[model samples]
Target: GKLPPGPLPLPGLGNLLHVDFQNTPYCFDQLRRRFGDVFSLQLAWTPVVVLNGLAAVREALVTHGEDTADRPPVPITQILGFGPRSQGVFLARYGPAWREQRRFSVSTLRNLGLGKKSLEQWVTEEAACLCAAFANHSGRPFRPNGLLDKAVSNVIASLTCGRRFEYDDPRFLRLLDLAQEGLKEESGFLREVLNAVPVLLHIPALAGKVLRFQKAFLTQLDELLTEHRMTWDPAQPPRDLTEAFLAEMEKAKGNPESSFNDENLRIVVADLFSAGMVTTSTTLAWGLLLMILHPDVQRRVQQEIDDVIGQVRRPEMGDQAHMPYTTAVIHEVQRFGDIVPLGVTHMTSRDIEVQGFRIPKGTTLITNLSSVLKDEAVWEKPFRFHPEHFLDAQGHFVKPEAFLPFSAGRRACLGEPLARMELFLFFTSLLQHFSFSVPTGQPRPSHHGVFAFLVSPSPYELCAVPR
Candidate 1:
């Protein structure tokens, strides 16, 4: 079997000279046009397969899902893990350990009311608090990123630790800061260099210097878990995921291969906290930015909110069914945002053929999710913010098969249900209570977002005038 064809590598530099690391998804799209949907790139010495467009991504991720389920051994993930190997649901290698952890996590999340009305109430309550926080701005221009981060992080905290902290709590503030800084550091050139030349990790001094934030973040998480562990009682119903995991650990004790252990618990919670918070919050930021950029869309969404959910009540998950326009707008926001453009890198579990291209076992795979999200062939106005893409001629909500923001297959996002609930409840509550607009005299914020690990809206302030 032959490896897929790609740009010619430049000696030891591989395709580094031909690729733009900053805008990788876009770069990969260009490469796809030249090399076809399934292409390959050699990052330094590592061989990588780039999957572009809906057809190629779906064929590889969904059809040959099991053959491409493993995660590549990235240096950053190793630093985030308890040891040399990644240990949590998001980055763990595809095997029995990952399977058990993922199974336990999905079931536990559902049991803890992920899609239930109880979780809806929790989100709506948080939405109320967030609205109150925005009202405190009192029509003045203020950055919504911080408050949005707090609101989103609180939801995850409540689920993981059984309680939510005050927005002003110092501990909570530190955790958020660490997560933000850690992500920022992880996406910088230094991290990229480390990933390309992983031998640097063998040098203790270099590894420690480069991964200090990850280590500190893990330490803080361990501290938080220790505190939560003290409150667990086997006789009582588990209050949250932590306590529930503790119960599982107790049952699985003495089983040497059991994935339910202290290290796994810590990494799993960190995975939920970071992944759950960043992606959703960034998407909300884009939602608000797009709202201000296109007032017509904002007004339409608000009008739908007013019709389906009145001023007397807060928005609920149940209201989504009746609000087609609003639902379409939210879906459009995700599509336009294109956050997580190049989805988390996946590795071929074994030899596999995708679209007639042979991908060898252990080869790194980059699923270009942005290509499908902005595919010219799939979307009528691929580059424009058009909500009608998700709406039918009869004005009912419709989802295209190409909407893979959460990716697909065995390695898709685990917190998808919780993320969806938060996005609807929080976004609707904010739109219902306030009119978001660019501050007077300030230039409109750029929608072209700052691309790091995720493409987040650049810093901008807006007036949240009470409706």
Candidate 2:
């Protein structure tokens, strides 16, 4: 078999056993360094292709498009807690259910001011709330994950369910706690063991441990579902993402073709809510850290605010077009962060021949999104956080084709547009009100050490000193 290119397959691990499957981007960087832009390997008797660099990744996924839209078969993913009914777009089955949920979710967000003022206003309001929380602390060092998560989740809660619970509210607190538990739970030694050797799931001790974790997560979800059941009123016009999906479910009631149902709606809402909130909040956290670590960059961002509106209550989206340096900085943070490396692996829908290579149906094609973002051939300085990446010499904002924070194609992020909008609005709004920096004597966490499923900045908090 003519594999693209790579090191010869090793023994039992199939070149993958020794390689940590969880921290995939690190693994990709090593393989690319050893094998060049395109490579293939065997993982546990399974044939795997690694698209090594920007060109290779784009050629296979973006250029070829749908041929690679298929999700890789993760036999273990199902055991971890996913099925045809998964609410997570990350793991949702690729069919009518995914499509239907995604379509309704995107539209619901759009209608809720996603691309318009409604979205802009809501994000600014949430951003102000976040700044206010920071202001309450008055530049004192605080472990702000709870405060951060609440701010992030509040916006999604408002947009998705048309309701925001006080931080002390029982249901909201439980969900926050569970969401944190679920993310960390999956990355620990136990979750790793379960993924590597799922046979452990059969052992009573191991099985119970795993089940306990899943139960904690699901119980939190069950509460959200109960609330929806009680508060759901079809006659009311749609407000949040949940209401719209629920309305659609009502319209599609009893139709076999419809993926909308109480279960699906709840799953979609929860999945989107968790993903949108977690990833967005984490990035904002990282962005704040980066600003503090690079005070000059942070200062320039503030200077932009000073020139336009110093110490303003908050900057709106209307302020975006005027702030090129600030604009470039946001793009740079995301670009240099390269948080999403192996964009959700797409599985081939069918055996298809492309570029004379027959990618068999069910094969997983991994796109090296990180490699693409940093292609020395594409980016000016692949490693540096240079705002110029988004700006021309003349200083106008320039959106690059290679910059895909949310990957492209049919399964692209449903919240992509809204997320981008939120990033700009929130980043600017916060920078306007406060300068985010490390607490006194706290050294910046190594950014290199912070690369997880998303580009994490070392766990450090900063005072959002009001400007």
Candidate 3:
């Protein structure tokens, strides 16, 4: 097989020395500049192929969609007890179970008001709560992470467990803390070490010590599921995804092939809740920080909000069409923030070819989503935070193909519709109620973000003066 071009690999290291694991996406971008759009890498014993730019990525992910749709068996997931057979929709292998779970999950979410007017109402109501929390600051400087997380988590909670939590609730607070800690643990150096040498996970002593956070997180989710199960009333119409799933489990009672089982239920709920909360909340955090850094853009967005959905009423998804500048700013914020830079790892189910490069079966594939997002060939100002990137001559919003923050193809983010609604409503609502600015006597916060599971804005304090 004629493999793609790449740097020479060492006997055991295998090009690991050529890349920075902490900032792998940027490292891949540098490699893409030297090697063409399609390139290969040898990460220790693993043979990996990296796809860069819109052309290669679209061709591989969309054109050869099925071949590249499968997820590699992540060592970390296995260590956490979710291997291929029992994995959830997000991390499940590309097969019957994965397809079934994904189809059920997507349809269930839609039926439960995802992307519908009912869900929009939920977001708007939450946005009001978020604004109230902000107003509690009384224009005083305060970090927004906790309030933002609480607001976003409640929306997911409403959909998953059919209930929302008060910000001060101890259980809700504990849930947030565990989830955050679990994410933090994932981004640490120990995880990479364990991934490379997964045998370490076999050592019970080391595994228990390193996986304390993950264990606790899963335990918390199991407790929630137990509580939900106790109060479940099948006679009534299903309230949310969990109840619906329970109904399906009953229907598929004797079916041997059904993926609707207890463990899958827990994993799917955890996947939805975690992905739902983190990504949107992080983006909103970036939105506010960017507003403080670029007051000009902030004022323009507020002006557009005023013209469309004024102070007299709450902003709705329907109002988005009339607020192009505001829409453009939101789009630009996702582009600039570049959350989930290197998309979730994917694998080739069988032998495949991309851009004339032959990649064999089981090769680990890394889609450098950051490369296409910031691809110079596509954007007018690729590296800068300019809202006009999404605006046309008349200032109408126009989303280019390169704006793939949620990634693309078979494995695109499942919560995209819900996320967009949250961003638009939360952002517009915040700007409508208050003007954000840096706190007094504080230097401007750096726009560069701290990379964890997602790229999040660095901690900063801001005053949100009422309009």
Candidate 4:
């Protein structure tokens, strides 16, 4: 009856204009302080309802079942392959298309060695390359984005399209930049404004800019698809996700209901690449920086790796269970860093009364996952870099639902298992082989984040020494 509870309108724009998508956690903290856990606010002509605390989010997202599971329509996501032809699960509407896409993703990713030795082997190989690159620096300070991005993107590219680009490849660099253009620009208040007012997408200039970005991305994907098609064998088991999609395309050749197609395959690959490359690698870059900034923690993490995983052959995936401190430290990195801070927008499927007020069927829902990162009830130290939050009294890493670097709900990241596996294998492997350190007296990472669906720290460098 009293609305969910948030701050009252203050000025011309009122409560609607004041929402910040990047550090949304603080707003939720402030609102919860004033209005209690669940709160509602009108954001730029859009009625927004936020569920604070882990229990509130769980009840609304998971406990409510499918009612709150549907995703709200966002104009720009359409251009990035969430449109009528979307075969990608993350943004597909929660229906036939979405179900098929999710099914395919789950099965194919599994078949392609997700949570399996095959995937770990591939990741370890790539991690080795990354370690070499870092070692080459001889601890000379260099921006981590380029090398780290290349490594992470390559791994995703290999999984999605079965190919990895060489560093300094102009075409590859262009593809990387195109995917990030919208992401970097859209992270700030301007993007939130645009998301709030769908009409803004209709503006010719704005529409044109978005179109160009999407078209360029699609074009690059198309090239990869053509290359993939040349050597693909549908009759055989897919060695990767791209082949799985191509195989599905053949299986659904005559079915109009099937969203699988060569073009859809291309977009799916791009989505996977875009999602993997930008987030995990960038986060690792920060992980390394933070590790370097706080050498004591870095030393402890490396010791955990050395004591448990040993320094012989780069840590194994099976070794994860044995290295609790290493695992907790990385999970803390994802939580403390808060990548993907302003989780993807989900739309209500129907005009349902949350608490009491109406959330119209198509209302754009912002999960604001970053806010939950610092949920006082959940994290022992919400703001600080405390790995103990994930560790047990005996020092084993314990999984917590609240540490959602991948966001949650129906559209939660399809790459969760892969990202986690990647972080562990690559990070621990490197730390096993080398130590990470920042320059003496150099300013630490400024807690800089370029947010969209992902948060990237400002570019910085680190030194990785062979153990």
RMSD of 2: 3.0
Model 4 ranges with Cα > 4 A deviation: 8-14, 20-24, 76-87, 114-116, 185-206, 351-360, 447-453
lDDT per residue for candidate 4 within 332-351, as digits (tens), equals 88888887665666767766
RMSD of each: 2.0, 3.0, 2.0, 2.9
lDDT preference between candidates 2 and 3, better one: 3
TM-score of each: 0.95, 0.89, 0.95, 0.90
Please provide the root mean square deviation of candidate 3 (C-alpha atoms, Å): 2.0
Q: Over the stretch 336-430, how does candidate 3's per-residue lDDT look in tens digits?
A: 99988888879998788888889899999888888888999999998888999999999889999998988788889879988988999999999
Which pairs of residues collide in model 4?
Answer: 4-39, 5-39, 5-40, 25-371, 71-347, 72-346, 72-347
TM-score-superior candidate, 3 or 4: 3
Residue-level error in angstroms, candidate 4, position 153: 0.6
lDDT of 1 by residue, 1-467 (tens): 77799999888888989998777766777898899988888887678989888988988888999898888876656666554222878788888888988998898778877544456666788899999999998798999999999999989888888778889998889899888877766555577778878888888887877768767887888888888888777798877888888998899889878888877888888889978898999999999999999999999999988888888798878899899999899999999999899989999878988888788988999998999999999899989999999999999999999999999999999888888889899999999989999988999788786777599888899999998
Which portions of model 1 miss their true places by more than 4 Å?
Answer: 75-86, 114-116, 188-202
Could you tell me the C-alpha RMSD of candidate 4 in Å? 2.9
Each model's backbone clash number: 0, 5, 0, 7
All candidates' lDDT scores? 0.86, 0.71, 0.86, 0.73
* Candidate 3 runs further than 4 Å off: 75-85, 114-116, 187-202
| Pairs that collide, model 2 | 54-372, 70-346, 70-347, 71-347, 113-119
